[PDB]
Design a protein around this ligand. Structure first.
Ligand SMILES: C/C(=N\Cc1cccnc1)c1ccc(Cl)cc1
Ligand SMILES: [Cl-]
Ligand SMILES: [Cl-]
Ligand SMILES: [Cl-]
Ligand SMILES: [Cl-]
Ligand SMILES: [Cl-]
Ligand SMILES: [Mg+2]
Length: 348
């Protein structure tokens, strides 16, 4: 067990191993507080996140367990990994607090799309890396569910990592009105049309790719209905085949109330783009999720010819998510989490 030291940073007690120095506040959502630190064992600048109220309800205890299981599994160059996890508790009986340690991310994709000039070569490399990371995530039957520019870290060498997996966190207030939290979501999840699957993440990649090519949000809806009208003007209204797959009768009645529209000409929307980029966007931005290109198929598309290496596009170890259907008490979720903290082995 390392030695721990205590300090108060903005109304919060932090108790951390001596290896982590020069802690300074960086942010705080409702899920925890974050400090930047220097990790003297590795020489990395790191983010230290202290969870807030991790075991306050069954829903909260299960979310804590879910986040720690996911972060411990993800071992890929284009996905955030877990550098460390610790608790100052010396036993299960005094266990209350969880701290997670990752590499400190500087810029996101929002800090390069808005304020920089991207060539076709930059777009090929950035989207290649997102798809390499997604092949790995999808091979574990994990859905990200929240891909958008603010969840993609990028360095000065244009190297990219996926972060901030959807832990089923987002509220109705957060998805209301003229908000980036909804502009990248697939229409079947935005409007609860049907049981969704991993194809939702490829819709989000299409929206991101379009925005790197034009410098403008593809579907900046003022609300759910405005955003659906923007989507159907580009891709066309649904045919009888997709309408049969929509489980809500009211959702089907509403769609049928709209005048029919054909798919637009993507070369006339993405004026001057690489024709191979236009072709790949037409294969991602398909309304019927069964017919979208997969991550593994997209890596083999001719747009990525200068980066594609089928011997360096790895898949994940198997991921057991059977806990998701399990009914447990707060203290049972808390014991499972404690075991995952004490069994952690750091990366090489
Ligand atoms: C960093 C980088 N390339 C590294 C690299 C070497 C060999 C194979 N694959 C990737 C890079 C930078 C800017 C643009 Cl626009 C594109 C790529
Ligand atoms: Cl230490
Ligand atoms: Cl990482
Ligand atoms: Cl504790
Ligand atoms: Cl964003
Ligand atoms: Cl597993
Ligand atoms: Mg985020």
């Amino acid at each position: 067990r390392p030695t721990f030291y205590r300090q108060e940073l903005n109304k919060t007690i932090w108790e951390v191993p001596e290896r982590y120095q020069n802690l300074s506040p960086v942010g705080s959502g409702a899920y925890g507080s974050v400090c930047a630190a220097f990790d003297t064992k590795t020489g990395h600048r790191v983010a230290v996140k202290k969870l807030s109220r991790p075991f306050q309800s069954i829903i909260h205890a299960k979310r804590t367990y879910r986040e720690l299981r996911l972060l411990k599994h993800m071992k890929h160059e284009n996905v955030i990994g877990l550098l460390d996890v610790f608790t100052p508790a010396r036993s299960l009986e005094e266990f209350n607090d969880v701290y997670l340690v990752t590499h400190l991310m500087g810029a996101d994709l929002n800090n390069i799309v808005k304020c920089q000039k991207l060539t076709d070569d930059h777009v090929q490399f950035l989207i290649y890396q997102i798809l390499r990371g997604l092949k790995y995530i999808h091979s574990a039957d994990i859905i990200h569910r929240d891909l958008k520019p603010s969840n993609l870290a990028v360095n000065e060498d244009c190297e990219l990592k996926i972060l901030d997996f959807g832990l089923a966190r987002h509220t109705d207030d957060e998805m209301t009105g003229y908000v980036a939290t909804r502009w990248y979501r697939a229409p079947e999840i935005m409007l609860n049309w049907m049981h969704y699957n991993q194809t939702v993440d490829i819709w989000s990649v299409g929206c991101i790719m379009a925005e790197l090519l034009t410098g403008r949000t593809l579907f900046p809806g003022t609300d759910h209905i405005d955003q659906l009208k923007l989507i159907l003007r580009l891709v066309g209204t649904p045919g009888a085949e997709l309408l049969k797959k929509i489980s809500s009768e009211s959702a089907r009645n509403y769609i049928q109330s709209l005048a029919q529209m054909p798919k637009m000409n993507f070369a006339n929307v993405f004026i001057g783009a690489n024709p191979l980029a236009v072709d790949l966007l037409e294969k991602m931005l398909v309304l019927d999720s069964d017919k979208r290109i997969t991550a593994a198929q997209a890596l083999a598309h001719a747009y990525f010819a200068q980066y594609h290496d089928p011997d360096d596009e790895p898949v994940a170890d198997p991921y057991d998510q059977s806990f998701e259907s399990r009914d447990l008490l707060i203290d049972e979720w808390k014991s499972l989490t404690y075991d995952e903290v004490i069994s952690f082995v750091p990366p090489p």
